[PDB]
Amino acid sequence: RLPEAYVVFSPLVDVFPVIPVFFLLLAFVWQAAVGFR
Amino acid sequence: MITALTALFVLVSLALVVTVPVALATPGEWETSKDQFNKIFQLWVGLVVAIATADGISTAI
Amino acid sequence: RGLFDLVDDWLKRDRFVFVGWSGILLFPTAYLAAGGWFTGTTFVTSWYTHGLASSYLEGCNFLTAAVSTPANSMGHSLLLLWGPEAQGDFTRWCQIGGLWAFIALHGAFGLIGFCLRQFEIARLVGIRPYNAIAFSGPIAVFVSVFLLYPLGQASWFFAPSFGVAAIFRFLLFLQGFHNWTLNPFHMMGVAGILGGALLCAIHGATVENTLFEDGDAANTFRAFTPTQSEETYSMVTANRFWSQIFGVAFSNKRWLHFFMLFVPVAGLWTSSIGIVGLALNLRAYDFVSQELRAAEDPEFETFYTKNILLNEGIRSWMAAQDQPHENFVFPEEVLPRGNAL
Amino acid sequence: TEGTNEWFGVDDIRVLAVLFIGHYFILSLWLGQYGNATEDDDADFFGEIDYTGS
Amino acid sequence: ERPFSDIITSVRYWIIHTITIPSLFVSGWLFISTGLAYDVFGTPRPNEYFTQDRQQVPLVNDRFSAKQELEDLTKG
Amino acid sequence: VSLWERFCAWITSTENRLYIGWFGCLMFPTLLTATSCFIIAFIAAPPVDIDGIREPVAGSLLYGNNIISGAVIPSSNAIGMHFYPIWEAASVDEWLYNGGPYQLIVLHFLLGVASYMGREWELSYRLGMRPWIFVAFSAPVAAASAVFLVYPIGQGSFSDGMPLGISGTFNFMLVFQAEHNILMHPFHMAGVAGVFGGSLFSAMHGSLVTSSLIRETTENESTNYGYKFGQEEETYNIVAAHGYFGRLIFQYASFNNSRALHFFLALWPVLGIWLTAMGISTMAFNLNGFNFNQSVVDSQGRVINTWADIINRADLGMEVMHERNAHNFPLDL
Amino acid sequence: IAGRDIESTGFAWWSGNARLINVSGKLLGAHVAHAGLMVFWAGAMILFEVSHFVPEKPLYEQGFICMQHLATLGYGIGPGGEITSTVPYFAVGVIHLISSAVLGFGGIYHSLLGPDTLEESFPFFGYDWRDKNKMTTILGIHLCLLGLGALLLVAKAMYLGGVYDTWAPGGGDVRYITTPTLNPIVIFGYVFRSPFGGDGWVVSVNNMEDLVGGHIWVGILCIVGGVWHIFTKPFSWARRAFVWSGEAYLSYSLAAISLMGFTASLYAWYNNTAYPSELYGPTGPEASQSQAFTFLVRDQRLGANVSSAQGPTGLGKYLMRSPSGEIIFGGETMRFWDLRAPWVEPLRGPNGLDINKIKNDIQPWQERRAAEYMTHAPLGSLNSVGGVATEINSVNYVSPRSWLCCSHFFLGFFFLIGHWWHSGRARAAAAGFEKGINRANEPVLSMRPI
Amino acid sequence: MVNWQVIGQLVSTGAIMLLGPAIIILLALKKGNL
């Protein structure tokens, strides 16, 4: 368990590890936005 | 205290994350707005230091 | 003119999908077979025929759902919905295993209709019908196994079930009971399939790596007009490369493609013969000379005898639950077993 | 032997001698053609592949 | 004609689909949740695999008397 | 010129019957010695104690085998992963008793196939081609290396490698099924899809190209004689073949570009074989396939079986009977 | 727009990152952004693993791969391998997470706003992919940084707290390494060792002194090589053998990183000194040896004399001899007789296992450890079942060793494929025929017939 | 007994996912250098 002063932020911590993939998906989204120039 | 300071830290980080790339990408925005981003960076550093000091004081013996 | 000419003109018109005269046989049967599989894997159970759960409604996933074969008590009945077993009563028809017969019977005619469609389109456009002999291969495989194998055995119960894990069970079952890997026909089938895969890869890399420089950008894909007269790759360079690397190479572009057509179809047609042989229990199981020597000499051992022992273990430990209608009861003291485990 | 940890599997002087003999024979043959190289600042080039003769 | 590339855009298409599709989805949900599928297809319920009397698997043993055998095995 | 320059010019010449190259220097001796040892051992080798329990197994023709059941037995279990060359045995008889030839053949063979890939690249470079055929050849090499070397490394003994025989392959397959539950690993399904799709596309492409031949022969000669070495003609007739493919299935699915077509043909089976080789390599470290045993229960708590349970029964039957005299303790770790 | 379209550079959208080869301003931003992503993942994973910690189970029963490294470095671990506090892990995660923001901002700036090329306003930070002097300078600089990192690890091991030692006299504990080995014979016999069984190449390091001495020597070598490659330029024998372009350098790096991945995976599988078994779990051989030891102990307690008991084949049920003579455990585990673990060494004499010590010198803690390692062998399935393939669903555990080995082995193979592809393309493009065969001057047509 | 964990996780994941396309839309509207 996290130190008592930060236990409230547990749901955010449970989501951080996966953020680095959303970047890879965002690259494709950006490419599709400009219509695959 | 710790939790309110960390909440302010999170809010400031969210605002900076949303705003910075828009300013950087658009031509001329970073040049004109190159006076408040320094203030926000100083606030960010100050929040980090304050959180560190408060956590150290609370945890130390 | 008459009705026949008008209908014939309508059926061969240019639409989104070609219909043709064979469409009447093709579309309904294939649609019904697909719908039957989709509803069977979703709602129907195998509790009363196999003692298993095989639907999503019971708790199975994509890899464990199936449409199982009918019960063994119904040997080779056609299992019609109005037949003397169900007598209407859709529920009893589903419970005794009529969906399997439904799927297989309408699907065979679907395959026949697809072959007829290939013939019809080839005649319409005016080219030789070679894609209809290549499809006859898989037709032979399907007919052979899914119909001839059960028809030579006791009942429909010993047929493959339309599912993912049921096919694995079929593979292990035939290996355990027939020694199917030792048959000299599955060997030639394996050779054909692997040779087909090899041929597909070597050609596409050979073709892709001898392209003529017909462009200016690194993306060589956009350097080919939809169809020109010249070839896009160098035949001489490929011939030189493969004759200096491997020692032998192609030089005729028609023989190459005929070989590509010929290999896998020959493999499939060869395996069908072995399956038809297994249908009558005419298997290739024992080497009599090695059996005699091993019986006389208790020190002669090869990998053959080890495989034989493995088959014995499979049979003994699988038959009890694989055939629930036989009421097999094997006490722990008669089951074959090695040391420790 | 088998479980010991000698360098390159060498357990005798003759093995080392013959390894030296091999590397050195091929090296002498190579130096017979590439032995007159110089490090002066005029034998260099500006490109991806060295086409400057020898 | 009128290909999918601009069929996907027609507003009337979208509104009629929004009217129609949820009715089918809810109909399927109610089909499962009411328990009517168990009766249509004869699939046993999670508490119906074994009854108080029969504690073994109900396999069918006869060809021409499957109706009576199944009627016995289900409830009777 | 010098002697070294003449030697180098002869090695890299593109005028010999078979290209040599610098990779050929490693290629030819290793492959030749592996071939010689394999032939001699397959014909006239004595029985080998594979399991380390002093029960030798015969594998050669002269000891009462045929072509189907003959093999070259893997090395002994007592050796493990130790290096066992000829000069480490007290005599040649002891070397043959413990399965010496297997290591020699396997090692020189793997070096040979790696040099084969290198030589393919080298000739592609010398001929002015594009250098991506050895990449395609890397997949069978990857699979062979995976089995022969990687599986023993993970399991800790050369005796668990695939025997160099026909029935030994079946034995290896059956034991692997019993112990690791392949056929439930998605990478094996990828490999099966790869081979089936490769055969499908080979047949389809051959049929389409053969059907679209123009008329140059009439009746009394094989149609193959129409093509001449060096002729200029794209490998189809666009109208007939494209219309046939666009009418057989929905019109949206038709490859009008030869480049993209012959790229897809190359890509599919190669990726399949890469994935199945990596599946074997990962299963070498005890990361098995899906487990679905006793996963369906009724309300009370009793277990209702599925097909996976029948597969499990077959696996148990295979497992309890393999290497009957080799185990002493309840777990096969 | 120019420089971001196919019509001006080729390189269609699915290979668009190849447009940065000759644009040295945006490449810096891209590489910095990937570095920031790496730091972010490290911090986030540390925090996530800390949030789910349970103080009862061992670390290998909770699916952690990140806490074990910090524990091995000597943070929050006590005697025997028990976790006492998790504050240092929280601090490490927080520091990484904070530094990630600075790295990401720098990447974004240098990539989206900074100058496209640095060869016009910052001559120091400029290159041409063909100036050998500049490439050697960059290599030497970053190499000196690597050497400094290795020396930092040595300093941490020697003065700043110490490291966890699993061979410690009295159970695993944190201790200062005060006498590192510096004799080059030992280190370079580790380097020049055969990789087969019994030797193990560099995986076989089995004490902390050798580890510290090796990292010392690596630091020294890296510093010296960095200075050398900074102050010199490539010699003649190197100029005529290499290809001087960016893709060639990429392929060179790819091959080495693939080799490193293979080596790391085999470290994770076989070693138990840098990967102590109290944190990662028993190795492959260790479970089988533990099973044999446990059953020997039970049968001896029942009353048997376990030295002359004959097995089914007559070879020895509990004890036998290795092909070189040492006394080893019997059964199918005769292949793993090279094992060395801190809980077995008390029973080993000058010629293998000791009969008298086995007879009347076995302590209960060894028995408990053997039972635990026997029942926690590294076997499992994809959906985390654990056990042999023919087992039922009761436990939920897969060892971290298997995960690490499989993952980095997969990555190593695919990066070897990278060496092949990128290197072949680099050389073909350098020669000048990567676009296709020149139809006007086909080289094959001017060769002697075969 | 409310199980706030699932609601919090869903809200956090939704916000994180929506963050990116929001900045893309903002850059597109302001006629930025996409």
Ligand code: CLA
């Ligand atoms: C690690 C992954 C990575 C990285 C670092 C890059 C980086 C880059 N790519 Mg690239 N790319 C990638 C993956 C990546 N790519 C993938 C996977 C693909 C395949 C789809 C491509 C396809 C591709 C193409 C086709 C092209 C590039 C180009 C470029 C360069 C200019 C991009 C540009 O103008 O942005 C423009 C984009 C925007 C203005 C919108 C994004 C704004 C920011 C970056 C969003 C993220 C902000 C972040 C969440 C907030 C952080 C706040 C911070 C303070 C903490 C740049 C160096 C271009 C190039 O070569 O330029 C010369 C180009 O033409 N890439």
Ligand SMILES: CC1=C(/C=C/C(C)=C/C=C/C(C)=C/C=C/C=C(C)/C=C/C=C(C)/C=C/C2=C(C)CCCC2(C)C)C(C)(C)CCC1
């Ligand atoms: C039998 C019968 C019949 C018939 C019926 C029918 C005809 C039906 C149909 C049905 C149908 C027709 C159905 C369908 C369904 C479907 C589904 C169920 C689907 C699903 C899907 C999915 C789920 C997918 C998945 C995926 C993939 C594959 C890939 C990608 C991803 C995804 C995920 C998307 C009748 C009446 C005659 C009567 C008698 C009996």
Ligand SMILES: CC1=C(/C=C/C(C)=C/C=C/C(C)=C/C=C/C=C(C)/C=C/C=C(C)/C=C/C2=C(C)CCCC2(C)C)C(C)(C)CCC1
């Ligand atoms: C830290 C540590 C350690 C270690 C140490 C050391 C000292 C290491 C080293 C390492 C090393 C020292 C390595 C090296 C390597 C090398 C290499 C890897 C090489 C390679 C080569 C190449 C790659 C070449 C190639 C080529 C050829 C073949 C010829 C011509 C062409 C070319 C150039 C391409 C120890 C274990 C003690 C302990 C733990 C810690």
Ligand SMILES: CC1=C(/C=C/C(C)=C/C=C\C(C)=C\C=C\C=C(C)\C=C\C=C(C)\C=C\C2=C(C)CCCC2(C)C)C(C)(C)CCC1
């Ligand atoms: C750390 C932190 C944070 C966070 C931040 C971040 C860093 C985020 C951003 C980033 C993100 C996280 C973003 C992402 C987004 C993404 C997305 C959401 C995407 C989507 C995707 C998709 C949907 C795709 C699809 C497609 C298309 C469109 C086309 C082509 C095809 C495909 C399928 C690929 C906060 C604020 C809480 C504060 C605290 C700390």
Ligand code: OEX
């Ligand atoms: O060596 Mn060939 O097979 Ca692999 O598991 Mn344990 O070890 Mn033996 O038994 Mn089962």
Ligand SMILES: [Cl-]
């Ligand atoms: Cl054992």
Ligand SMILES: [Fe+2]
């Ligand atoms: Fe062709």
